[PDB]
Amino acid sequence: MIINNLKLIREKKKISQSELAALLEVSRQTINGIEKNKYNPSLQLALKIAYYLNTPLEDIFQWQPE
Template sequence: MDKKFKLIQERKKQKLTQKDIANILEISLSYYSAIERGIRNPTLELAKKIAELFNKTIEELF
């Protein structure tokens, strides 16, 4: 499975919107959306936060 779709799948499993995730991570909605679509890459620190949020490893998501 394409890794960018992994983020979408995990987010939907938790019944969260992109806006919910952006608010939790304290980043802009457009930035998170771009990460999900594979247009932008998160910093290592942000990737760690996203992985923790979904209870996954960075490798599993990215």
């Protein structure tokens, strides 16, 4: 069970999809797709979101293998 709180974390800060995408050097659709947890986030993608928002990966994404 992977629980994504990408958008929740985004709300904890307040940076919009257009500006965040530009910061991550990605397309706006890329970050917006991640918000819907259905775009397949690879670590590099997750890392940059984590990095620019400065938020622990564990906070952003939650992994419950149980």
